Design a binder for these strands. Structure first.
Ligand SMILES: [Mg+2]
Ligand SMILES: [Mg+2]
Ligand SMILES: [Mg+2]
Ligand SMILES: [Mg+2]
Ligand SMILES: [Mg+2]
Ligand SMILES: [Mg+2]
Ligand SMILES: [Mg+2]
Ligand SMILES: [Mg+2]
Ligand SMILES: [Mg+2]
Ligand SMILES: [Mg+2]
Ligand SMILES: [Mg+2]
Ligand SMILES: [Mg+2]
Ligand SMILES: [Mg+2]
Ligand SMILES: [Mg+2]
Ligand SMILES: [Mg+2]
Ligand SMILES: [Mg+2]
Ligand SMILES: [Mg+2]
Ligand SMILES: [Mg+2]
Ligand SMILES: [Mg+2]
Ligand SMILES: [Mg+2]
Ligand SMILES: [Mg+2]
Ligand SMILES: [Mg+2]
Ligand SMILES: [Mg+2]
Ligand SMILES: [Mg+2]
Ligand SMILES: [Mg+2]
Ligand SMILES: [Mg+2]
Ligand SMILES: [Mg+2]
Ligand SMILES: [Mg+2]
Ligand SMILES: [Mg+2]
Ligand SMILES: [Mg+2]
Ligand SMILES: [Mg+2]
Ligand SMILES: [Mg+2]
Ligand SMILES: [Mg+2]
Ligand SMILES: [Mg+2]
Ligand SMILES: [Mg+2]
Ligand SMILES: [Mg+2]
Ligand SMILES: [Mg+2]
Ligand SMILES: [Mg+2]
Ligand SMILES: [Mg+2]
Ligand SMILES: [Mg+2]
Ligand SMILES: [Mg+2]
Ligand SMILES: [Mg+2]
Ligand SMILES: [Mg+2]
Ligand SMILES: [Mg+2]
Ligand SMILES: [Mg+2]
Ligand SMILES: [Mg+2]
Ligand SMILES: [Mg+2]
Ligand SMILES: [Mg+2]
Ligand SMILES: [Mg+2]
Ligand SMILES: [Mg+2]
Ligand SMILES: [Mg+2]
Ligand SMILES: [Mg+2]
Ligand SMILES: [Mg+2]
Ligand SMILES: [Mg+2]
Ligand SMILES: [Mg+2]
Ligand SMILES: [Mg+2]
Ligand SMILES: [Mg+2]
Ligand SMILES: [Mg+2]
Ligand SMILES: [Mg+2]
Ligand SMILES: [Mg+2]
Ligand SMILES: [Mg+2]
Ligand SMILES: [Mg+2]
Ligand SMILES: [Mg+2]
Ligand SMILES: [Mg+2]
Ligand SMILES: [Mg+2]
Ligand SMILES: [Mg+2]
Ligand SMILES: [Mg+2]
Ligand SMILES: [Mg+2]
Ligand SMILES: [Mg+2]
Ligand SMILES: [Mg+2]
Ligand SMILES: [Mg+2]
Ligand SMILES: [Mg+2]
Ligand SMILES: [Mg+2]
Lengths: 386, 130, 132, 63
RNA sequence: GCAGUCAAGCGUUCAUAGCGACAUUGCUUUUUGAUUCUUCGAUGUCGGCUCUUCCUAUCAUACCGAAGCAGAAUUCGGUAAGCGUUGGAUUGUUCACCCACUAAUAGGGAACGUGAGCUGGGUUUAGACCGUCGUGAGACAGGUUAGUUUUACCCUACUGAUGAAUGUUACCGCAAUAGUAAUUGAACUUAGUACGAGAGGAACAGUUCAUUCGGAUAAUUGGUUUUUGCGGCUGUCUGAUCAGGCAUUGCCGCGAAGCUACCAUCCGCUGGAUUAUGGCUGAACGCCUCUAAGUCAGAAUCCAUGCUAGAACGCGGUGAUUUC
RNA sequence: CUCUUAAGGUAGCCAAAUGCCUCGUCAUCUAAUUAGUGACGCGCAUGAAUGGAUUAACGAGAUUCCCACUGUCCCUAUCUA
RNA sequence: GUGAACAGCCUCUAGUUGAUAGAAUAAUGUAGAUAAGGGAAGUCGGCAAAAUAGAUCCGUAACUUCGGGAUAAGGAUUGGC
RNA sequence: UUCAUCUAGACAGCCGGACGGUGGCCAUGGAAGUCGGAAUCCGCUAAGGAGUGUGUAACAACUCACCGGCCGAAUGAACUA
């Protein structure tokens, strides 16, 4: 029979299967369209998600009811120590799609990167790339043939960067290595730029700037095996039903005599590659700068990191991106940050933003004090001492 | 609602410069004049408040929206005046409409005014007391 | 509806009774519908402060009972979060009987009124005491 | 961006943090956290609650 | 139940704007009959609940064509099922009816979808009351009240989860194929303007919000508390004190972390080809004609862009590959 | 006055757990009532120990409403064994 | 012991410490809990749950077979010293 | 398939004319070819209905049959399957 009352379907089917991502680094699938009339530059950037905090700022949005009035907004903080180029990869157009033609690497590589190639680093004989490096022997005999090979061919050039994991508070030691597409100009200045950067780091003011709308590509917080009530948003069933409420009642009609792909089932929730778009950059922080949490209106030297330190993360000692709102993934997870794939002119974009103030109260509790200074200035002296 | 419904009266006291009263081509004392005014309604449904005001007055100030021209009710309130033997004078009003809405040009405007006056005198000659 | 109104948490679904804050003669207001609400299977429509509801008077002068009228919610009693970061709430829910144009069948509102509700409704502002 | 002070504890209230309550009398109350708010609604007396600003003043502590 | 054909007539005037008699040709299988082919060593009956998908004879939303289309509003039709189609009072109801919001509250199918999915209000056992019937036992497609809703561990399907083999191992990627997504409204302003005698009274562009849906996220606010974390309280037991036990987590206040809420916050891309329809050039047919050749535009459509998985028998690049 | 059968439904009661028509009609209660209550009564097919009408108290009986209450619901989340 | 009490809760005498174990802490369950604002809108129906609860003092309606209805309703108070 | 027109100039297109008794008779509040009935004659003609439409309150004003100018070879109507 027909339905009885119409209601929208539960859950979006262009986000299927709801399985676990192949890896915890979400694949950055599309890069932006290359404009070759602009300097060789990176298009994405790796990151580590630290935590969130709160800001206030004036609002320039004429005709709103909060024009020139302060607003307060959540923000996520990505710890972005500069990343070090160690490779160049070049892809050719072919009638079956882009083909990687060759890879060429830097002459030496941090052991924190070479860790990426082992599952038992400690007990290895760490011989990875020992004999590749010898092609640099006299003048780079072999390697300069490859670089020419990329220049001759190669509709697209990608650079292999890797995170300086050791510069963060994680227990990891094993860096994250990723391709980043050079949107430079001329497939040649693109690959010169790569050679001119082997083992040379790239900071992130090079890549992004204040107010730049950017996308976040990461792997959703995993949650294990979920019932359909919470996993799909299904209606919890009436208190009286025998055999369970967190269920779908009619797994399907008699015909098609098959449970169909479109019906909510119990299974894995979270741990899904998500590409989430249009998060405005609110501040690009310098580690080689004091007073990261400072602002032209607050002006009381303090770092970004909050009292007690970011919960489950640690302290911010490096460059960081502070982006408006929230992003897929949890604290400590690798986070690719893409430049926007289109030129947004919404004017919600395009809006210059200036932080009045950046909360740095503790997140481990009902944090009352911005700085250990102002605690004391408020509390007084105490018995243990001072 | 922004529509006059009852026609209501007000008496205005106003002066005139010494050279202005010299032109007055009828016997005329002093320099201060007393204007007994009535603000009338346009709607046909209220025409009874026009004849009620035209019985108590001597001249009539007739207003014509410049862009709308002389309209059907302009025509019939005039037949109300000339029946009662009342002298008219005209204000072609609302011109800022012509510069903004119509982007009019000086000749475009003058000739607007001419045919409008031509239109009123047609009404005036047909019904004005021979 | 003289203005645009930013979203605020809903706290008065249908069936809710709120005090009638005006000297109209009504002691309360029983919400049966909320103007501007949309549709979802099984979802009770609900009002926040400033919203125009359709109500009846369960306690009050007979001349106002047995009859559906529009009301405007002026306090809300359910924590809501302004764009300046504050979660606030009143001690009670309350509204005033109005007419669709937004005018007020009352004559003077008693008790505080919320900022959002009074920006929306001038005729309501004209009779409000302490706002926000 | 005036910070405000907790009505019950005199604690400092940074933007976004805590709650604000409009009593019937139009008297505004600010609470920096949930605990301060809970106590006040239990009708507790801050002068008798040991950690509040206005209990150290009534006991001339730390001044 | 729905749709054509002829056109007397309605439409002041005028057959076909919108309608349409007398006739007559059809379609549909959510109606009810007619049959009795399957099932009586048994295919779980009504309705709701839940949830998915499909149909179009389209209620709304996109773009259009017609009008007895001035505006506003409405009607008729076209492409069109992309997307939505609701909250309640009485009833077991399907149906009905009314209140009320709404852009709209369209009709249907899937064993009159869906009972090892629920419920069990109705129907339809045995208990019992009434009314009419009956000599009686009893009967009623009359009323009424009580009345056990069983199994999955197997196969397949669906959801998620591993995995042999390919010389070994590790890293970075490609993209076949499959999936795909956003929705709709209001206020300001345009404007008391176009139009209109008046009464009334728009639209495109711009601004601010909002609804339904989606994916995440936890700074905040809120909820949860075995942090049995700190405090408080009763009873009893440890001779008192200190400090504890027991009271199935003894109870109360607060309670961080975690989990989480339109109860919380953030985010949801833009190129092309088309439909209908409007056109250009232009014959057929010395004219005309959007069409016959050729061609411009153009829709909530489709294809891509983007997003999701990645063929476990599709692929590339790359590293290191066992002294004894 | 009369016919069929002997009599011809009185006192009461009612769309009642008894009314087909029927969601009866009127009043009331609700924004809205096929529900409830009060009325009406040519009552398909009420009615006097096949007992009629009424009744305080009692009732794990059927039914309607109100106050309090609340995860029944909006609309779900969370903790324990 | 508490307490009106052979209630419940803790203890002395006496008896028992027996129910296959270990490690994990997904979904769905069964059993036990809590919940912002709203408060039956959920449902055939308030089913289930919640609210109430002892005792002292106060106050207590229609109706009634005068016996009741009654803990009606409804207020106040409660430790320690 | 049947019937028509055409080098004595058709069909099409364009272009000129489309008159005079006459506002023809009965009506009509008005009706001058053009709401409607009845009449359907004549004159002057290359031809022009007592009117094919549009129009008016009624005339006016355009329009068409009909005639002609132009061009120069074929073309028109009604049926069948
Ligand atoms: Mg439907
Ligand atoms: Mg059950
Ligand atoms: Mg925290
Ligand atoms: Mg105008
Ligand atoms: Mg429902
Ligand atoms: Mg909390
Ligand atoms: Mg049908
Ligand atoms: Mg016609
Ligand atoms: Mg028709
Ligand atoms: Mg059969
Ligand atoms: Mg048979
Ligand atoms: Mg079966
Ligand atoms: Mg169609
Ligand atoms: Mg149209
Ligand atoms: Mg017409
Ligand atoms: Mg669909
Ligand atoms: Mg319902
Ligand atoms: Mg069927
Ligand atoms: Mg069935
Ligand atoms: Mg089944
Ligand atoms: Mg069953
Ligand atoms: Mg039953
Ligand atoms: Mg029975
Ligand atoms: Mg009987
Ligand atoms: Mg008998
Ligand atoms: Mg019967
Ligand atoms: Mg029966
Ligand atoms: Mg499987
Ligand atoms: Mg595809
Ligand atoms: Mg007006
Ligand atoms: Mg617009
Ligand atoms: Mg969610
Ligand atoms: Mg918490
Ligand atoms: Mg103890
Ligand atoms: Mg214990
Ligand atoms: Mg093409
Ligand atoms: Mg996308
Ligand atoms: Mg594979
Ligand atoms: Mg007899
Ligand atoms: Mg009787
Ligand atoms: Mg009866
Ligand atoms: Mg009766
Ligand atoms: Mg019968
Ligand atoms: Mg009811
Ligand atoms: Mg009754
Ligand atoms: Mg009888
Ligand atoms: Mg009898
Ligand atoms: Mg007897
Ligand atoms: Mg008796
Ligand atoms: Mg008695
Ligand atoms: Mg004792
Ligand atoms: Mg005992
Ligand atoms: Mg005892
Ligand atoms: Mg024994
Ligand atoms: Mg459980
Ligand atoms: Mg349970
Ligand atoms: Mg609650
Ligand atoms: Mg509460
Ligand atoms: Mg309540
Ligand atoms: Mg109900
Ligand atoms: Mg029942
Ligand atoms: Mg119960
Ligand atoms: Mg009592
Ligand atoms: Mg005492
Ligand atoms: Mg010939
Ligand atoms: Mg000819
Ligand atoms: Mg010819
Ligand atoms: Mg005539
Ligand atoms: Mg005529
Ligand atoms: Mg004759
Ligand atoms: Mg003639
Ligand atoms: Mg003529
Ligand atoms: Mg001819």
């Amino acid at each position: 029979s027909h339905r009885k009352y119409e209601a929208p379907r539960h859950g979006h089917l262009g986000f299927l299967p709801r399985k676990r991502a192949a890896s915890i680094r979400a694949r950055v699938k599309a890069f932006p369209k290359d404009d070759r009339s602009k300097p060789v530059a990176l298009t994405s950037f790796l990151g580590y998600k630290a935590g969130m905090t709160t800001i206030v700022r004036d609002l320039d949005r004429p005709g709103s009811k909060f024009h020139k009035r302060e607003v307060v907004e959540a923000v996520t903080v990505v710890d972005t120590p500069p990343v070090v180029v160690v490779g160049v990869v070049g892809y050719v157009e072919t009638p079956r799609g882009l083909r990687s033609l060759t890879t060429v690497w830097a002459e030496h590589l941090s052991d924190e990167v070479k860790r990426r190639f082992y599952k038992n680093w400690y007990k290895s004989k760490k011989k990875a790339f020992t004999k590749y490096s010898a092609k640099y022997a006299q003048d780079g005999a072999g390697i300069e043939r490859e670089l020419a090979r990329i220049k001759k061919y190669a509709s697209v050039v990608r650079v292999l960067v890797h995170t300086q994991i050791r510069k963060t508070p994680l227990a990891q030691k094993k860096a994250h290595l990723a391709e980043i597409q050079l949107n430079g100009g001329s497939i040649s200045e693109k690959v010169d730029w790569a050679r001119e950067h082997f083992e040379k780091t790239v900071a992130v003011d090079s890549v992004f700037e204040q107010n730049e709308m950017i996308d976040a590509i990461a792997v959703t917080k995993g949650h294990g095996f979920e019932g359909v009530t919470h996993r799909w948003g299904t209606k919890k069933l009436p208190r009286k039903t025998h055999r369970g409420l967190r269920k779908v009642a009619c797994i399907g009609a008699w015909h098609p005599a098959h449970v169909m792909w479109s019906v909510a089932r119990a299974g894995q929730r979270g741990y899904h590659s998500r590409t989430s778009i249009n998060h405005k950059i609110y501040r690009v922080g310098k580690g080689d700068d004091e007073a990261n949490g400072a602002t032209s209106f607050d002006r009381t030297k303090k770092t970004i990191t909050p009292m007690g330190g970011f919960v489950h993360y640690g302290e911010i000692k490096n460059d960081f991106i502070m982006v408006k709102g929230c992003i897929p993934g949890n604290r400590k997870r690798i986070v690719t940050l893409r430049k926007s794939l289109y030129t947004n002119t919404s004017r919600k974009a395009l809006e210059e933003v200036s932080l009045k103030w950046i909360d740095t109260a503790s997140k481990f509790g009902k944090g009352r004090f911005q700085t250990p200074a102002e605690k004391h200035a408020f509390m007084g002296t105490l018995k243990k001492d001072l | 609602r922004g529509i006059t419904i009852k026609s209501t009266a007000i008496s205005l006291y106003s002066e005139m410069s010494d050279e202005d009263v010299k032109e007055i081509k009828q016997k005329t004392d002093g320099n201060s004049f007393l204007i007994n005014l009535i603000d009338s309604p346009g709607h046909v449904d209220f025409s009874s408040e026009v004849t009620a005001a035209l019985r108590v007055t001597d001249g009539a100030l007739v207003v014509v929206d410049t862009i709308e021209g002389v309209c059907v009710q302009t025509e019939t309130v005039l037949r109300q005046a000339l029946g009662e033997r009342i002298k008219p004078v005209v204000v072609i009003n609302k011109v800022d409409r012509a510069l903004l809405e119509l982007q009019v040009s000086k000749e475009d405007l003058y000739q607007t005014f001419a045919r409008t006056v031509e239109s009123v005198n047609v009404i005036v000659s047909t019904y004005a007391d021979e | 509806a003289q203005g645009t109104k930013f979203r605020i948490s809903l706290g008065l679904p249908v069936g809710a009774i709120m005090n009638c804050a005006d000297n109209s003669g009504a002691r309360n207001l029983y919400i049966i519908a909320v103007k501007g609400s949309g549709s979802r299977l099984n979802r009770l429509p609900a009002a926040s402060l400033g919203d125009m509801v359709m109500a009846t008077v369960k306690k009050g002068k007979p001349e106002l009972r047995k009859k559906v009228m529009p009301a405007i919610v002026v306090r809300q009693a359910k924590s809501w979060r302004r764009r300046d970061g504050v979660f606030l709430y009143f001690e009670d829910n309350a509204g005033v009987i109005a007419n669709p144009k937004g005018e007020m069948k009352g004559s003077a509102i008693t008790g505080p009124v919320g900022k959002e509700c009074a920006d929306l409704w001038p005729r309501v502002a004209s009779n409000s005491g302490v706002v926000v | 961006m005036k910070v405000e002070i907790d009505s019950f504890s005199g604690a400092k209230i940074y933007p976004g943090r805590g709650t604000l309550f409009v009593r019937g009398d139009s008297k505004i109350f600010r609470f920096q956290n949930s605990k301060s708010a809970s106590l006040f609604k239990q009708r507790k007396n801050p002068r008798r609650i040991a950690w509040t600003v206005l209990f150290r003043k009534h006991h001339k502590k730390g001044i």
